[PDB]
Amino acid sequence: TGLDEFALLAENAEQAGVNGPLPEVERVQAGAISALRWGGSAPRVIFLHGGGQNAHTWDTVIVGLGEPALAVDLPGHGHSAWREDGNYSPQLNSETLAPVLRELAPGAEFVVGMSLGGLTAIRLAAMAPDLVGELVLVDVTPSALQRHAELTAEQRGTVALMHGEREFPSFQAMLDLTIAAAPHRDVKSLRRGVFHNSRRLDNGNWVWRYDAIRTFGDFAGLWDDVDALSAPITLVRGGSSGFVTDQDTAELHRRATHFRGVHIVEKSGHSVQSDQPRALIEIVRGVLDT
Numbered sequence: 069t070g071l072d073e074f075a076l077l078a079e080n081a082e083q084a085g086v087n088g089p090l091p092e093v094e095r096v097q098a099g100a101i102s103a104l105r106w107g108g109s110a111p112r113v114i115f116l117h118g119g120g121q122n123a124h125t126w127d128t129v130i131v132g133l134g135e136p137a138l139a140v141d142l143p144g145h146g147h148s149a150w151r152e153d154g155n156y157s158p159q160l161n162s163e164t165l166a167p168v169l170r171e172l173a174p175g176a177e178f179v180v181g182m183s184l185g186g187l188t189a190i191r192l193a194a195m196a197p198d199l200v201g202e203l204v205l206v207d208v209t210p211s212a213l214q215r216h217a218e219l220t221a222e223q224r225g226t227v228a229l230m231h232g233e234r235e236f237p238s239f240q241a242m243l244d245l246t247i248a249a250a251p252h253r254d255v256k257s258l259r260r261g262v263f264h265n266s267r268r269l270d271n272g273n274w275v276w277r278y279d280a281i282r283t284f285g286d287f288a289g290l291w292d293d294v295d296a297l298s299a300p301i302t303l304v305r306g307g308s309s310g311f312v313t314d315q316d317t318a319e320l321h322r323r324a325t326h327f328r329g330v331h332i333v334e335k336s337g338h339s340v341q342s343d344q345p346r347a348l349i350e351i352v353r354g355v356l357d358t
């Protein structure tokens with residue numbers, strides 16, 4: 069389409085149940101990392117999306133919260149550079165991101181990360197304390213993503229041997245795939261997500277903005293980082309998500325120096341920011357104490 073990436077923000081304000089003028093937002097870049105900068109040049113919160121997502125996953129939450137924020141595109145996602153070695157490990161993501169965040173979000177105490185983003189946040193908190201005052205993990209722990217990585221490994225192996233990146237005859241065909249994976253979800257919300265996560269080729273076909281993740285990375289080291297972090301950790305689970313177990317949550321409590329507790333969001337799957345953004349806004353607002 070010809071549609072600008074900020075053309076649907078009224079839909080995000082309605083989903084967040086807020087009215088009034090939309091906040092200012094623009095895309096920023098420092099080398100390999102692209103981000104959306106909301107509310108001007110002094111972000112209070114950094115948001116890190118999950119595997120297969122981009123920064124726009126946070127639009128509803130950011131519009132509802134009304135705070136200045138930086139929503140970053142992880143390597144291999146959104147407008148951030150791909151890597152030919154297909155490796156978007158939390159550790160590698162953190163190494164690329166830290167100097168960019170020092171430049172674009174030096175005064176943001178709070179980091180909210182979902183899934184791969186949440187483990188990226190843990191590694192940032194460890195390697196760059198001065199930055200990260202407080203972590204909010206959305207539906208992930210090191211153990212939980214390790215279990216997901218182990219289930220998906222055979223198929224991440226098989227896809228790795230297709231060297232095709234896929235192409236799609238239409239936008240609708242990508243939307244059909246996303247409907248198939250979440251058919252109970254409002255299709256205007258799904259359509260908005262696919263719009264941001266996809267682009268049209270000159271040859272009329274469509275492709276995903278994200279790189280197949282051939283590989284994730286390191287978790288023993290990631291638990292050592294949890295043992296060392298001083299940033300308090302809040303966990304947010306999806307009540308309909310099996311991704312994080314009660315034992316996962318207890319393990320996180322035992323290793324963290326300051327676990328603030330788990331919030332369990334009724335009628336949310338794994339992507340709490342997509343399924344129940346209003347409930348996530350209230351929890352993030354509470355952490356801000358604001």
Ligand SMILES: [Cl-]
Pocket residue numbers: 118119120183184185
């Ligand atoms: Cl992920």
